[PDB]
């Protein structure tokens, strides 16, 4: 909970301290998705039984789609 929140914070600050990079922002967005999941999974175990862990897998699929989509976008760019 406190771990995932701090990961989200540092990544959001690191995003707004990009230094033009572009590639750094993609890494940062992925770690923000990881940060949200860890606090949700902690809540899922705190509450008990599958409900939150279900939405955690949903974020994992959407993040994987987000990464595959954003990386293909870089390929469309830099011709």
């Amino acid at each position: 909970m406190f771990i995932g929140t701090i990961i989200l914070v540092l990544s959001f600050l690191g995003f707004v301290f990009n230094r033009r990079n572009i590639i750094l922002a993609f890494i940062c967005l992925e770690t923000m998705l990881l940060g949200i999941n860890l606090i949700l999974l902690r809540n899922s175990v705190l509450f008990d039984d599958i409900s939150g862990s279900l939405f955690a897998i949903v974020i994992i699929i959407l993040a994987g789609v987000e990464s595959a989509i954003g990386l293909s976008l870089l390929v469309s760019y830099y011709r």
Binding site: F2, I3, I6, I7, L10, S11, G14, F17, R19, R20, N21, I22, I23, L24, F26, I27, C28, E30, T31, L34, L38, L41, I50, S51, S53, L54, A56, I57, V58, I60, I61, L62, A63, G64, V65, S67, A68, I69, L71, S72, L73, L74, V75, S76, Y78
Partner: protein, 118 residues
């Protein structure tokens, strides 16, 4: 007893150091390796199944893709085990169908973005 298991809060001490290392790292090559290490730190925190679920997809595919794009595109600048399937396949079956739909776009999107076919 088990002082190292109680002091296993070291995950937050390691994550703050790892994330500050992804920003500080010159060249993306080191930053992606540190993203893998940060995801491995988060996997070690999921021991405190999702660890192996993360290593297989986030480190296994996402991170592999993140390294595959930088090496090629020059760019640069300085009773059952947790189940889940019981709800997603029965109750949230509408979301299961839409997750296949979000996966249609996942492969069809790049096909209409980087093609140039005759």
């Amino acid at each position: 007893x088990x002082x190292x298991x109680x002091x296993x809060x070291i995950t937050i001490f390691l994550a703050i150091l790892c994330t500050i290392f992804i920003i500080s790292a010159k060249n993306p090559m080191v930053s992606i390796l540190y993203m893998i290490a940060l995801f491995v730190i988060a996997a070690m925190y999921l021991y405190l199944i999702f660890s192996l679920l993360y290593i297989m997809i986030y480190i296994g595919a996402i991170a592999v893709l993140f390294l595959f794009i930088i090496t090629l595109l020059d760019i640069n600048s300085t009773t059952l085990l947790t189940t889940i399937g019981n709800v997603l396949l029965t109750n949230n079956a509408f979301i299961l169908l839409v997750l296949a739909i979000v996966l249609l776009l996942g492969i069809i999107g790049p096909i209409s973005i980087t093609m140039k076919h005759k």
